[PDB]
């Protein structure tokens, strides 16, 4: 099975393209999860911001199946998100300074490690191949799926692998597409 | 030839866009023997007749908890009506006289979500012939809770609590 955006694990207002690698946001924050999730190992995928008009925004990252599809990513204890506006990271809807923001034309990387035994999981974010530092440590245990959360008609494309435009140079990983 | 069916949805749309003129001839706010101010009936009202819409600010259903903790935290009031599993009518800051309708366990009106054009509206219909001067009333259908809002609808068979 191809790793794509989910057929039904999606907020219905979001516009998904036929090949299910593209999503346009509609109005308030809403989320779409991928078709596959991981629970052990190091995994990766990339997101390209196709178009980011003024006053639109994205929170991208990793979510658990129980994460709210009608709220932004990182609203819950089930998701962790990286907001284009100001580069803030989000979990349980608490915003903390993490990195610089991103915008239209950038390619973002998403690294997760869920080591086998206990091992300390982490989340690292990338902007155009550049490590932004550890975003989270020892996250809530469970299965994590790549998640997209868009606010107001911005368009983003997802790459699950196997080959990425900016493969990380400092970390070992498998592409999400291997799932 | 082609057999045609009667559309119930066409006259409902025609009835709704006359409601705003209809309700101002029909309803009024007075002091209630149930609680505070209540909406009353200013002219004989027939069964199935649309009384009024519960208009407000239509927010998504996910924003309810944050809204209630801001409302109940600031001590403002509930004034929220569920439209859907996706949409909720917040009449706390913006509404109409329909927010003065009280609850009963023995109501004379009922709430219904209907569709006109492409949107949904919460409209209150009369369950029976309602005479001029009666207090209009519907069943709030609050979710059941634990240790409790006392009800004062004053009719027998009253459930003793709003929830």
């Amino acid at each position: 099975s191809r790793v794509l955006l989910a057929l039904h694990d999606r907020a219905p207002q979001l516009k998904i393209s036929d090949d299910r690698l593209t999503v346009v946001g509609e109005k308030g924050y809403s989320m779409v999860r991928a078709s596959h999730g991981v629970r052990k190992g190091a995994w990766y995928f990339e997101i390209t911001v196709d178009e980011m008009p003024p006053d639109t925004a994205a929170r991208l990252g990793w979510s658990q199946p129980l994460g709210n599809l009608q709220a932004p990513l990182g609203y819950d204890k089930f998701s962790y998100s990286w907001r284009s506006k100001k580069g803030t990271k989000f979990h349980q809807s608490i915003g903390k300074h993490y990195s610089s923001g991103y915008g239209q034309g950038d390619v973002l990387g998403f690294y997760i490690n869920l080591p086998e035994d206990r091992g300390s999981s982490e989340i690292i974010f990338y902007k155009n191949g550049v490590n932004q530092g550890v975003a989270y440590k020892d996250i809530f245990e469970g299965v994590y799926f790549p998640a997209i959360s868009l606010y107001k008609s911005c368009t983003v494309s997802i790459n699950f692998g196997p080959c990425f435009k900016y493969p990380p140079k400092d970390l070992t990983y498998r592409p999400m597409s291997d799932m | 030839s082609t057999r045609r069916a009667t559309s119930l949805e066409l006259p409902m749309a025609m009835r709704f866009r006359h409601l705003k003129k209809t309700s101002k001839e029909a309803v009024g706010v007075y002091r209630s023997a149930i609680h505070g101010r209540g909406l009353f009936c200013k002219r004989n009202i027939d069964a199935g007749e649309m009384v009024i819409e519960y208009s407000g600010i239509v927010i998504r259903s996910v924003l309810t908890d944050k809204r209630e903790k801001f409302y109940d935290g600031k001590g403002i009031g509930c004034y929220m009506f569920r439209m859907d599993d996706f949409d909720v009518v917040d009449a706390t800051m913006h509404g109409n006289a329909a927010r003065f309708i009280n609850h009963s366990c023995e109501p004379n009106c009922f709430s219904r979500v209907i569709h006109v054009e492409g949107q949904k509206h919460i409209v209150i219909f009369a369950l029976r012939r309602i005479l001029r001067g009666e207090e209009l009333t519907y069943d709030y259908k609050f979710p059941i809770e634990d240790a409790k809002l006392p009800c004062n609808c004053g009719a027998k068979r009253c459930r003793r609590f709003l929830n």
Binding site: G28, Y29, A71, S93, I94 | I57, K66, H94
Partner: peptide
């Protein structure tokens, strides 16, 4: 409280879900 005529769709902002 201001009193409404029809329904008015709320227009969310980007920080609508965030704890300040």
């Amino acid at each position: 409280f201001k009193e409404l005529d029809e329904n008015v769709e709320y227009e969310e902002r980007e920080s609508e879900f965030d704890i300040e």
